[PDB]
Design a protein around this ligand. Structure first.
Ligand SMILES: COC1=C(OC)C(=O)C(C/C=C(\C)CC/C=C(\C)CC/C=C(\C)CC/C=C(/C)CC/C=C(\C)CC/C=C(\C)CC/C=C(\C)CC/C=C(/C)CCC=C(C)C)=C(C)C1=O
Ligand SMILES: CCCCCCCCCCCCCCCCCC(=O)O[C@@H](COC(=O)CCCCCCCCCCCCCCC)COP(=O)(O)OCC[N+](C)(C)C
Ligand SMILES: CCCCCCCCCCCCCCCCCC(=O)O[C@@H](COC(=O)CCCCCCCCCCCCCCC)COP(=O)(O)OC[C@H](O)CO
Ligand SMILES: CCCCCCCCCCCCCCCCCCCC(=O)O[C@H](COC(=O)CCCCCCCCCCCCCC)COP(=O)(O)OCCN
Lengths: 488, 62, 92, 64, 88, 57, 324, 138, 77, 100, 40, 58
């Protein structure tokens, strides 16, 4: 009876710790004895400890978590792919929550509900990766969606935060409605909400032999909703505004934690529920458009957060290249690109949060940064080059293997567009470089020193980026095992 | 109620077979041209029989 | 089994007619947040009632499992309501 | 497909789906018993029966 | 033929909600009603499909969708009243 | 610091404030007067008492 | 199938005259509690007083400019009155003395009660006043708040019987009423029905709405009276709900097979009028309750306690396998 | 014919929702859309959902919207000559026939109980979010 | 903030009471009563009448404690 | 309810009590399980104390961290003990204990 | 000890303490009494 | 004794409450010939339909 729950401890524990943190915060934030203490950093440290403990629980249950798989079959199906995806998403969440501690006390934002909502959205993401049915898929999407709608509008003094939160709300609600309408007809035309039986009724007959106007258009609507979820061009109506308006730690959690889970979800849907080979076309054109428009639009931006938003869109296109070529190498390149992009995004947002102590807004404020803090300047330049794809760094390997996967399937146009978009993409990255090493403005902005957690995370990520090409075997082997575990 | 239905099911079967042979002789009557019509056959390739479908979803509530 | 709603429809039509004939006799002669908060709490604690309704009726069929799942649901909403209570937003 | 009926007895198409799934459980090529898949699909919607009745009504109509 | 009528009615409600949310970029109130209309249309799709197939996975998920609809409406009006506090 | 912290008396007070003992005691008083004879007088037939010193017409 | 309208009229007209005589009973009982007589001159014992009141209200000029869109103000009384009547289409008086036989008929009652909030809201909004609308909104918030306690108590009742059908609920009370074990739950349900109709010490929202304004709004002569009629019909309905659920709906109270001459149709009516008498007693025995503490009470002493009662009933029934 | 007029009136109300002149009338037509939808579900044979639509949509969501608005201002061909008499009724299964409520509760809290707890977590997210944003308490 | 006014006619406010008060929406911030609605003019009338003719004015001042004011006037005399 | 605890990937190691009761696996805690439980609880308590000095809540933070650490360490120890009995873990001790 | 604080809490909040007591009874009956009567 | 005057309006409203039910009961019995069943399930409506058909045939 109780031992049938050995496969859900990494989630039951995080829920219980979330409840304990919420209770402790609400009890001791209104105590007159301590005079309404600012227990946001306390709740944040306890939440980081809880995330570490549930990561330890998840890591040591590799032989476990596959028991009572018949009992849990209707609800979720977790396997080697799900195990690694969860163990990486939880690490990303831990890093994000760790690098935002100074944000709580530097600008006096002691709202512990931020941390509990991070934790609960992370629980929703952990549900999403294990989700193996349309209903659980949609519910796990909605958990993180509502958590982020609440969190984005948390800072209720700036017109950017509120308007960005409202735009995110409306766009996410429309995307969720589109996706749910898509799932409704796939249920209607076949029954069989479960993924296991959805991958068996559609494999029997190809879409070319006979045309089913329900399943095809439901699959199309599901794909459209998912592309809205990851903000893939042309479904990028407000994403730069969302990333600019939202608070910096929120945007740090976004574009890493949500995208990983949504991409795992899209992998599960694409591999099983798609046998008509009609999602190759929708991913093809949309990824090409994302590549081109991200490369051509990030060069015209003068702020920092908008540039990171458009770089995220471009990297989403680069990763989506892997969906068009459906092979083991394509999925391997996709997952490796996701991993490298997650590390580089964490490093870049650590940079942005570091200069947030003095309210950095534009790209010209970080002028002559090689004089005040040379080592931070070097770190930022290295991270920017890693974004660019320069060979002697991580990020070049991901683009390399994505191009290899694209050429493996004979999508020769994908390789050419990838090359040209990379060529333009590196240009404005180097443009960012010039204003930060070479030309010195008349007025210099002075940045106060950083704290230990952000510095440690930044140093670890910087040494990972530079020295990745020396020893990349473990990542490649993890990714090859994960790609094959979708079937066996 | 479980010791009463075999006779009610029996009379329902009688009525249904009466209506079914009437409809079969009606269908064989209209279709004498266009050779290739096998009159009444099981559309189920497995051979299992189910009641004739009607385009009225949930009819047993009104 | 569901023909018993047409009487409701006819009753509603006749009640509307009676209301009309009752109203026609003489003829023939700024913002508060607390309101939003109480509405939200009502919505949240009305969804739980809509969830309770299938649980109570079918509680016989399900022993020691549905009961404990509903108890976990109640515990989650009780944690929510406890956070509601201490934070304020519940008194005027 | 799931097997939980509305009235509380069983899905009217559950037996056909289970027969199809059992055939596919030991058939590495889907073409061998695509007949069962067709039976399950047209058990959901009754497409073929409705087409036949449409043909009957067309034979009625052409007599004009 | 009633399944066709049901599906067409729900689809027209869906496209009408899309129409409502697309036109007025500023109302911010009609958008929420249009989103609710979209959710309503999808709920009717699920329930009608569940009745037609005599399968129960349609009504369970339709009932669960109401929680999402209510939560989205609550958060939407919270953000709306926060936004309105700035102006006027 | 007004305190009533005793194991026995906390139970006694927490019951009176929970079973509406004061409300019931104030409610049963009106029912006593419900069955009691009334004090009114039908004016046109019975007049209220006066005094020889009354000041009228 | 043409027999329905006769039943509809037979349910409607006695309800209206019962509302009139319930107003008369209110006046008379409050008079007797305060050592008075109340309306006695008209009729024999005041029995013709409501008729005189009605004929007086009709024979007056109607103040109906409505100072507004002319539509929303005339539809609010219609909506509240039709709702307070349609809530009566499911009550199982004795055995076949029920108009509609809904297989749920309880979640239906909850829905109908919850829908009876828009009437007062649009009445307040349509009535162009800066305080009447606000008072109507506070009253709506009060009813909305006590709806959840009503629903939890309904769930408590529904757990024991096991089916939503109202007739089966009374059928399940052959052994005991459900009022003997659930007496705290019965008190809670009475207080919630008392506070959800603004007919209680839980009254202040509307009481101050007239004190500070005097109803200097578009006050129709007897078009406004439909609110009063609907409120008293709701009084009667929520008086009968308590004797449907917690008391025996029509079963004899404490009876040996001797007093079988009387039918079950009056066993219901006697309990209904007893609960109405309790309503009047509570009104004329307690002082009014402030809205500041009204909301706090309704949210902090009834929701947690009713939830605890739900939990305890469910746990006790499950433990000993006493479910339906 | 009951379905056609009800669907048409619902469609008209939904159309007037998005092209309304003032938010009050928009919400008023928004209520009528769900009223007609619940009637349509009632015709479909699902009484439970038809009344949950009153309890939730026009019971709490419509009230919430109104509160916010107040302040801050292949088909089978119709030929049926020989089909109304070809209805085969299987009497087995009519004995001990569950309703729309017993069947739903049989498997909502027992087999698919994870999704139920996910919906609970969604409700908790909504409850927390409505408080963090809007507590001015000045 | 709005400034609504009292003056209810039922005897709740003991009648003849006019109260113009400013509230903060729900909480009153300042109440300014407007007395003078019952200024008969007794003080001016007493001067025109004998010490005995002026006694019944004192019954009409505080008309729930009629013999209390007569007591004060008699003691003064 | 119908419960079947059968792992997709079978245990590579000998299995004892394929469905172990809660009390027995709690009673199967070895010295390593107690050590890891203790170190997890101690780390959690230390983090709770250290973090909650700036807000001033030094004791309540300790208690919260202690509760979190107790729950996490107990879950980890139970998982290890179960996987040992289920056979997923090296379990060289109670396989010998089973024989005698 | 905890008894003083618990009793002071019960004195100040009667409804919350009563609700907790009844809920604890209703949760203790099926979690403790039920297994011991299951085994007769 | 003296308090019966207050109970007369209660008696009137109770009597009209009981005739409320009795009216619809007598109307339904008059034309249908039977009182209304407490539980109408699909099985009960199925036998009602079949009984109507067999009575019509006979
Ligand atoms: C709140 O302040 C108010 C009062 O004080 C309580 C009133 O009494 C009143 C007076 C209201 C009434 C006396 C309601 C009585 C009205 C009627 C009896 C006429 C309407 C009833 C009918 C047309 C149904 C008559 C049919 C039958 C009795 C069935 C015959 C068999 C009003 C309007 C008011 O606003
Ligand atoms: C049991 C099920 C779960 C129950 C909890 C679930 C809900 C979560 C609630 C978590 C928050 C609860 C936090 C409050 C608990 C009581 C707080 C407390 O005990 O601290 C007391 C007293 O506590 C202590 O003194 C010692 C307590 C800590 C020592 C024990 C550490 C915990 C060890 C392991 C945890 C227990 C074992 C695991 C559970 C069995 C107050 O001391 P101070 O006021 O800080 O001291 C004076 C401060 N000043 C100088 C400024 C005036
Ligand atoms: C892996 C690490 C596990 C332990 C982490 C404990 C979490 C401590 C975070 C404390 C953050 C905080 O609240 O700020 C305080 C910072 O907390 C600290 O200073 C240190 C806290 C303890 C950290 C190291 C103690 C041992 C932990 C290592 C593991 C053993 C305040 O610093 P200050 O105001 O005194 O700065 C002024 C300074 O004197 C000027 O130079
Ligand atoms: C014979 C047939 C009669 C049928 C009618 C039923 C009787 C109706 C009698 C009604 C008479 C009184 C009506 C007055 C109406 C207004 C009174 C409300 C006052 C009120 O709400 O007080 C609250 C307590 O009420 C409550 O708590 C009430 C709920 C009762 C709780 C249960 C009490 C015992 C529980 C024991 C359970 C035993 C079973 C365990 C297995 C808390 O008042 P406060 O404000 O001072 O509190 C401080 C917190 N801010």
């Amino acid at each position: 009876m109780f031992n049938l729950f050995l496969a859900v401890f990494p989630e039951i524990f995080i829920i219980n710790a979330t409840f304990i943190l919420l209770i402790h915060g609400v009890v001791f934030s209104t105590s007159k004895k301590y005079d309404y203490p600012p227990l946001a950093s306390n709740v944040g440290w306890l939440g980081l400890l809880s995330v570490l403990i549930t990561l330890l629980l998840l890591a040591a249950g590799a032989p476990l978590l596959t028991i009572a798989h018949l009992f849990w079959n209707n609800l979720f199906r977790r396997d080697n792919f799900t195990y690694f995806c969860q163990i990486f998403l939880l690490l990303s969440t831990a890093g994000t929550i760790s690098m935002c501690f100074d944000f709580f006390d530097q600008e006096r934002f002691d709202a512990f509900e931020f941390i509990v909502l991070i934790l609960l959205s992370t629980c929703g993401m952990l549900f999403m990766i294990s989700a193996y049915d349309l209903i659980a898929m949609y519910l796990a999407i909605e958990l993180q969606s509502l958590c982020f709608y609440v969190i984005a509008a948390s800072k209720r003094k700036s017109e950017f935060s509120t308007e960005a939160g409202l735009k995110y709300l409306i766009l996410g609600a429309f995307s969720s409605g589109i996706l749910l309408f898509g799932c409704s007809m796939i249920y209607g035309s076949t029954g069989a909400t479960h993924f296991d039986q959805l991958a068996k009724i559609l494999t029997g007959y190809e879409i070319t032999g006979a045309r089913s106007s329900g399943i095809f258009m439901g699959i199309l609507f599901i794909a459209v909703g998912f592309l809205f979820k990851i903000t893939a061009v042309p479904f990028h109506m407000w994403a730069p505004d969302i990333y600019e308006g939202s608070p910096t730690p929120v945007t740090a959690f976004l574009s890493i934690a949500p995208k990983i889970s949504i991409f795992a979800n899209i992998l599960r849907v694409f591999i099983y529920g798609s046998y008509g080979a009609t999602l190759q076309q929708i991913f093809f054109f949309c990824s090409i458009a994302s590549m081109i428009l991200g490369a051509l639009a990030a060069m015209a931006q003068t702020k920092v957060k908008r540039l990171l938003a458009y770089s995220s869109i471009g990297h989403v296109g680069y990763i989506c290249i892997g969906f068009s070529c459906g092979t083991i190498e394509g999925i391997q390149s996709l997952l490796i690109g996701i991993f490298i992009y997650a590390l580089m995004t964490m490093d870049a947002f650590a940079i942005v949060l570091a200069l947030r102590q003095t309210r950095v807004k534009y790209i010209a404020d970080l002028g002559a940064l090689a004089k005040t803090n040379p080592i931070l300047a070097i770190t930022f330049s290295i991270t920017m080059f890693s974004y660019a794809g320069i060979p002697p760094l991580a990020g070049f390997c991901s683009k390399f293997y994505l191009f290899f996967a694209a050429l493996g399937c004979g999508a020769y146009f994908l390789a050419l567009v990838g090359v040209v978009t990379s060529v333009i993409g590196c240009f404005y990255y180097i443009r960012l470089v010039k204003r930060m090493f070479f030309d010195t403005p008349r007025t210099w902005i002075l940045y106060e020193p950083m704290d230990r957690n952000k510095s440690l995370l930044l140093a670890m990520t910087s040494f990972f980026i530079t020295l990745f090409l020396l020893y990349p075997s473990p990542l490649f082997s993890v990714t090859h095992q994960m790609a094959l575990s979708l079937y066996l | 109620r479980r010791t009463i239905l075999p006779i009610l099911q029996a009379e329902e079967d009688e009525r249904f077979v009466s209506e079914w042979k009437k409809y079969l002789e009606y269908e064989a009557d209209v279709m004498k041209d266009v050779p290739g019509w096998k009159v009444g056959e099981n559309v189920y390739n497995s051979g299992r029989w189910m009641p004739p479908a009607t385009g009225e979803l949930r009819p047993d509530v009104w | 089994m569901m023909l018993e709603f047409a009487p409701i429809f006819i009753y509603l039509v006749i009640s509307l007619l009676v209301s009309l004939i009752l109203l026609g006799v003489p003829f023939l002669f700024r913002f508060d947040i607390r309101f939003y908060l109480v509405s939200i709490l009502f919505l949240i604690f009305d969804l739980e009632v809509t969830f309770f309704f299938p649980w109570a009726v079918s509680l016989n069929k399900i022993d020691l499992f549905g009961f404990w799942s509903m108890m976990a649901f109640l515990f989650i909403l009780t944690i929510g309501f406890l956070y509601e209570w201490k934070r304020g937003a519940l008194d005027w | 497909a799931s097997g939980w009926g509305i009235t509380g007895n069983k899905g009217r198409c559950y037996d056909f789906w289970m027969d199809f799934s059992e055939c596919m459980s030991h058939c590495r090529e889907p073409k061998d018993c695509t007949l069962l898949r067709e039976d399950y699909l047209e058990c959901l919607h009754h497409s073929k029966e409705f087409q036949r009745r449409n043909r009957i009504y067309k034979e009625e109509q052409r007599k004009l | 033929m009633d399944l066709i009528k049901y599906f067409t009615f729900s689809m027209i409600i869906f496209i009408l909600g899309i129409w409502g949310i697309l036109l007025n970029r500023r109302n911010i109130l009609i958008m929420l009603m249009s989103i609710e209309l979209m959710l309503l249309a999808v709920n009717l799709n699920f329930l009608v499909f569940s009745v037609s197939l005599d399968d129960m996975m349609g009504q369970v998920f339709a009932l669960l969708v109401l929680t999402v609809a209510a939560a989205e409406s609550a958060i939407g009006l919270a953000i709306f009243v926060i936004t309105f506090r700035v102006r006027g | 610091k007004e305190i009533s912290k005793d194991w026995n008396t906390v139970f006694e007070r927490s019951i009176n404030t929970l079973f509406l003992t004061e409300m019931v005691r104030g409610l049963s008083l009106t029912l006593k007067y419900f069955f009691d004879p009334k004090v009114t007088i039908n004016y046109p037939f019975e007049k209220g008492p006066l005094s020889p010193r009354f000041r009228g017409e | 199938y043409i027999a329905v309208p006769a039943e509809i009229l037979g349910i409607i007209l006695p309800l209206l005259l019962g509302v009139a005589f319930l107003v008369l009973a209110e006046r008379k009982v409050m008079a007797f509690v305060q050592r008075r007589k109340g309306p006695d001159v008209v009729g024999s014992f005041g029995l013709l007083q409501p008729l005189a009141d009605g004929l007086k209200l009709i024979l007056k000029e109607p103040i109906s400019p409505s100072s507004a869109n002319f539509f929303l103000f005339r539809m609010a009384p219609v909506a509240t009155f039709m709702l307070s009547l349609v809530a009566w289409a499911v009550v199982p008086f004795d055995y076949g003395m029920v108009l509609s036989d809904l297989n749920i008929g309880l979640l239906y009652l909850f829905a109908i009660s919850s829908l009876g909030v828009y009437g007062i809201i649009i009445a307040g909004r349509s009535s162009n006043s800066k305080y009447a609308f606000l008072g109507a909104l506070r009253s709506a918030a009060q009813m909305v708040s006590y709806e959840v306690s009503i629903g939890l108590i309904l769930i408590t009742v529904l757990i024991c019987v096991g089916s939503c059908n109202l007739s089966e609920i009374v059928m399940a009370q052959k052994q005991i009423w459900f009022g003997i074990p659930l007496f705290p739950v019965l008190v809670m349900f009475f207080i919630s029905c008392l506070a959800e109709t603004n007919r209680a010490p839980f009254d202040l929202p509307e009481a101050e709405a007239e004190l500070v304004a005097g109803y200097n709004v578009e006050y129709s002569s007897m078009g406004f009276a439909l609110f009063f009629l609907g409120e008293y019909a709701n009084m009667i309905l929520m008086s009968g709900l308590c004797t449907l659920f917690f008391l025996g709906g029509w079963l004899p109270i404490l009876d040996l097979p001797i007093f079988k001459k009387i039918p079950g149709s009056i066993w219901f009516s006697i309990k209904v009028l007893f609960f109405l008498f309790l309503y009047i007693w509570v009104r004329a025995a307690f002082p009014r309750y402030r809205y500041d503490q009204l909301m706090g009470l309704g949210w902090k002493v009834f929701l947690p306690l009713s939830l605890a009662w739900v939990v305890s009933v469910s746990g006790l029934l499950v433990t000993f396998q006493w479910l339906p | 014919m009951i379905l056609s007029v009800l669907s048409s009136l619902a469609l008209v109300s939904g159309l007037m929702v998005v092209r309304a002149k003032n938010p009050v009338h928009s919400v008023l037509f928004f209520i009528l859309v769900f009223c007609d939808t619940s009637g349509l579900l009632l015709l479909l044979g699902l009484d439970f959902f038809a009344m949950i639509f009153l309890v939730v949509y026009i019971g709490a969501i419509a009230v919430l919207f109104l509160f916010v608005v107040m302040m801050f201002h292949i088909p089978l061909l119709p030929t049926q000559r020989n089909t109304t008499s070809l209805r085969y009724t299987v009497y087995a299964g009519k004995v001990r026939s569950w309703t729309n409520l017993e069947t739903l509760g049989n498997l909502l809290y027992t087999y698919y109980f994870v999704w139920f707890l996910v919906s609970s977590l969604i409700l908790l997210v909504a409850m927390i979010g409505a408080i963090v944003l809007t507590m001015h308490r000045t | 903030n709005f400034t609504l006014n009292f003056g209810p006619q039922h005897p709740a406010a003991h009648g003849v009471l006019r109260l113009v008060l400013e509230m903060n929406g729900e909480v009153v911030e300042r109440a300014e009563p407007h007395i003078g609605l019952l200024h008969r003019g007794t003080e001016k009338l007493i001067e025109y009448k004998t010490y005995l003719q002026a006694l019944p004015y004192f019954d009409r001042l505080d008309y729930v404690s009629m013999m209390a004011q007569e007591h004060a006037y008699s003691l003064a005399v | 309810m119908n419960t079947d605890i059968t792992a997709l990937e079978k245990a590579q190691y000998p299995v004892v009590d394929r469905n172990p009761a809660f009390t027995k696996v709690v009673g199967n805690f070895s010295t390593l399980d107690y050590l890891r439980f203790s170190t997890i609880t101690g780390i959690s308590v230390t983090v709770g104390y250290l973090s909650g000095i700036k807000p001033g809540i030094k004791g309540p933070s300790m208690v919260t961290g202690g509760l979190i650490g107790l729950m996490g360490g107990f879950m980890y120890a139970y998982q290890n003990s179960a996987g040992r009995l289920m056979g997923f873990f090296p379990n060289d001790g109670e396989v010998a204990s089973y024989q005698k | 000890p905890v008894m003083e604080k618990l009793r002071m809490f019960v004195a100040q909040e009667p409804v919350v303490a009563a609700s907790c007591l009844i809920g604890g009874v209703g949760l203790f009956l099926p979690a403790v009494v039920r297994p011991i009567l299951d085994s007769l | 004794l003296v308090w019966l005057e207050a109970m007369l309006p209660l008696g009137i409203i109770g009597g009209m409450l009981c005739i409320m039910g009795n009216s619809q009961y007598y109307i339904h019995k008059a034309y249908h010939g039977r009182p209304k069943h407490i539980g109408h399930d699909e099985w009960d409506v199925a036998m009602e339909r079949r009984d109507k058909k067999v009575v019509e045939k006979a």
